[PDB]
């Protein structure tokens, strides 16, 4: 997230009637790094029938 995320604007909604200018949070994801899933191994099962 950017500096002053809580004051970034949304100007996407139009043709209101109020609440057509506001803050919003906007958050991109970057996969140049990816940390691996933290998982409960004990709770891994494998099935049968």
């Amino acid at each position: 997230i950017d500096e002053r995320a809580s004051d970034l604007r949304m100007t996407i909604r139009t043709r209101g009637r109020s609440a057509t200018i506001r803050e919003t949070y906007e958050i991109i994801c970057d996969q140049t790094k990816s940390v691996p899933l933290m998982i409960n191994a004990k709770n891994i099962a494998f099935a049968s029938n």
Binding site: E3, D7, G16, R17, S18, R22
Partner: protein, 493 residues
């Protein structure tokens, strides 16, 4: 384009572009034209035949007379036509019956002034309704007269056309009035009309200065005064900017942090004054003295009792105490709410309140300013540069009457007037507006944008009526965070 439908009825289309957020939407307004517009006057001979049935089962009555106000030659007996600037600049003289006897409101004029300031509009409609024998306002229409209609051409602006429509209304109606000898005087206060008269264009109109008409009349001569709108006036009252819009943006996060570190930003709780919205004071405890927050853009989207970071200004800019009082009853009460929707209503976040305040309000700001320069006790002065911390709550209030039409059941944008006097008038939009006028309301605040000078709220819930003692007792409970419900299911255990 203009095309026959029926006997003395023809239609035309006006297509124009409106932009809401890059919207680019062509709006088509069909405008019907009829020769059936009354002149509203007892000097008119054929006007009996012109009037038509209405909802009230009656042919519209006359309110303008066969004796209007009379001045020396070549003026004679004269109907006063008012320009668009004149309605804003001269409003109290209008409310006086002493110098404005027989008045024609162009309909194009009534449209412009209603969009800028809806109070001025409503008051003027009420003056029209409660007209008598000595302050007689009528509206004459000409957007819908087929002999006073104007086109809109390429390679010009809407202001040029708006002024042309009035020039054409005068020459039309002054010609028709010649067998009865009643002259039309356009009393104007806009630079495009006054210098159109001077360069010579037409000579079939008496065109007058606002001040020149006033100064001949000895009942208003110097008693009530006015300025040009900004044709030859430029603010130096207490404003310096032409626009009231645009509250500053906050200092960015690290730019705060670095300023706290290096000890150039100070912080404390802004304790706003209950008598002023412009005079706020922070308790900065490396001083004994209140540190003053003065003027709209130093306040920086304040709310009461917030943790505010403030940077000091130089001793050169440091003020002395201010003696005036402002409230939501005498200030901003001929400013109106921003319109953000509609097909012929504003769709912009500016050019709604470029200036529409009263003469009284102008003179009070001005007088503060004259005292302020011989006032003593010059002490620390600042601008809020960040709101560290919020203090929103549910706030009680009541619905403004002159920012709403009671008849109208429309989704009206209208002000909540809070009972805490440390915040301004709060904008909301509601299709319950008539309902809510008699009732004490609860809004909360949503946000304050950086483009508007009034917060955005939303309506939460209703309390009872304002006559009700119970309802006042309850509102005061809500405001001061005092819970009134019976104690819960778990309490009893």
């Amino acid at each position: 384009r203009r095309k026959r439908l029926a006997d003395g009825l023809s239609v035309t289309q006006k297509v124009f572009v409106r932009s809401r957020n890059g919207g680019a939407t062509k709006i088509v307004r069909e405008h019907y034209l009829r020769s059936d517009i009354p002149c509203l006057s007892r000097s008119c001979t054929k006007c009996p035949q012109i009037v038509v049935p209405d909802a009230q089962n009656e042919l519209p009555k006359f309110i303008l007379s066969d004796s209007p106000l009379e001045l020396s030659a070549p003026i004679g007996k004269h109907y006063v036509v008012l320009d668009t600037n004149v309605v804003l600049q001269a409003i109290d003289l209008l409310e006086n019956p002493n110098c404005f006897f027989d008045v024609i409101v162009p309909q194009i004029v009534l449209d412009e002034v209603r969009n800028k300031s809806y109070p001025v509009y409503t008051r003027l409609r009420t003056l029209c309704r409660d007209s008598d024998d000595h302050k007689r306002f009528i509206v004459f229409h000409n957007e819908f007269s087929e002999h006073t209609f104007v086109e809109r051409l390429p390679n010009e602006t809407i202001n040029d056309r708006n002024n042309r429509a009035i020039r054409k209304t005068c020459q039309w109606y002054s010609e028709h009035l010649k067998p009865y000898d009643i002259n039309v005087v356009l009393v104007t206060n806009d630079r495009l009309n006054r210098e159109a008269a001077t360069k010579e264009v037409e000579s079939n109109i008496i065109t007058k200065s606002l001040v020149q008409y006033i100064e001949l009349l000895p009942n208003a001569d110097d008693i009530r005064d006015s300025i040009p709108q900004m044709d030859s006036f430029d603010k130096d009252l207490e404003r310096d900017t032409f626009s009231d819009f645009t509250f500053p943006e906050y200092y960015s996060t690290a730019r705060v942090m670095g300023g706290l570190k290096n000890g150039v930003l100070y912080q404390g709780n802004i304790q706003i004054s209950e008598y002023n919205f412009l005079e706020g004071s922070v308790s900065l405890p490396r001083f004994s003295k209140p540190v003053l927050i003065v003027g709209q853009k130093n306040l920086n989207r304040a709310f009461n009792g917030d943790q505010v970071i403030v940077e000091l200004l130089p001793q050169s800019e440091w003020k002395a105490p201010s003696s005036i009082v402002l409230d939501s009853e005498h200030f901003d009460v001929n400013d109106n709410p921003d319109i953000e929707a509609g097909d012929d209503d504003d769709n912009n976040e500016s050019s709604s309140n470029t200036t529409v305040i009263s003469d009284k309000q102008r003179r009070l700001l001005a007088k503060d300013a004259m005292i302020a320069q011989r006032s003593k006790k010059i002490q620390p002065t600042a601008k809020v540069v960040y709101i560290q911390r919020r203090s929103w709550r549910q706030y009680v209030g009541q619905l403004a009457p002159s920012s709403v039409d009671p008849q109208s059941s429309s989704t009206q944008n209208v002000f909540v007037i809070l009972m805490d006097k440390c915040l301004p008038k709060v904008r909301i939009r509601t299709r319950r507006a008539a309902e809510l006028l008699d009732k004490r309301i609860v809004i909360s605040i949503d946000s304050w944008p950086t483009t508007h000078k009034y917060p955005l709220g939303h309506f939460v819930r209703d309390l009872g009526t304002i006559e009700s003692a119970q309802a006042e007792t309850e509102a005061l409970l809500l405001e001061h965070d005092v819970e009134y419900r019976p104690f819960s299911k778990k309490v009893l255990e």
